[PDB]
Design a binder for this molecule. Structure first.
Ligand SMILES: CO[C@@H]1O[C@@H]2CO[C@](C)(C(=O)O)O[C@H]2[C@H](O)[C@@H]1NC(C)=O
Length: 165
């Protein structure tokens, strides 16, 4: 039975998570941008990086943005679609929330969102969050609307990896 730190060490060794510049501290209580999380998903699920394609209109989303290949992969894969379809905003600097992460992993794992789910999640996410809870990706007392901590993301990613095996 591994601690959150040991799960992190393992995922980092596997190249799925990385740390912070200048320090080996894993900063498990810190948050994560949607950009960095896209990359996590790409490494976690072995997705192919997509260069030279730009499907969003966010400021500074272009060839100079290191995250675009990962964001494009998770979008082609159907894991993430962004926050606004008519304006094509992904919001890559905003932080990944528990309910957002829940959707991505539930989808990757082909678990079915719970229609009729009763919980504190935003409307669009209720079923994804319930499915993620039921599958043990996040604790039931996690706050679906909060920014996910890196600890929570390490636990969720580690559990998801084990379910793909
Ligand atoms: C605010 O709208 C939500 O935005 C969420 C952003 O996070 C993810 C995981 C994403 O697809 O990128 O999920 C999004 C939700 O589907 C939802 N987006 C829309 C367009 O309805």
């Amino acid at each position: 039975a591994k601690t959150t730190q040991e799960k992190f060490d393992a995922l980092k060794e596997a190249g799925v998570f990385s740390g912070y510049p200048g320090t080996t501290d894993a900063k498990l209580g810190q948050d994560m941008t949607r950009a960095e999380f896209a990359k996590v998903l790409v490494k976690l699920f072995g997705l192919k990086e997509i260069h030279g394609q730009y499907s969003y209109k966010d400021k500074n989303y272009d060839a100079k943005n290191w995250a675009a290949p990962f964001i494009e992969a998770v979008t082609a894969e159907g894991l993430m679609q962004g926050k606004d379809l008519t304006k094509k905003i992904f919001d890559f600097n905003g932080k990944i929330t528990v309910e957002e992460a829940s959707k991505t992993l539930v989808t990757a794992l082909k678990l079915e969102p719970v229609k009729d789910a009763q919980n504190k999640a935003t409307d669009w996410a209720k079923g994804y969050f319930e499915a993620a809870v039921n599958a043990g990706l996040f604790s039931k007392d996690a706050n679906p609307k909060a920014n996910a901590t890196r600890a929570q993301l390490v636990e969720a990613a580690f559990a998801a990896d084990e379910m793909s095996k």
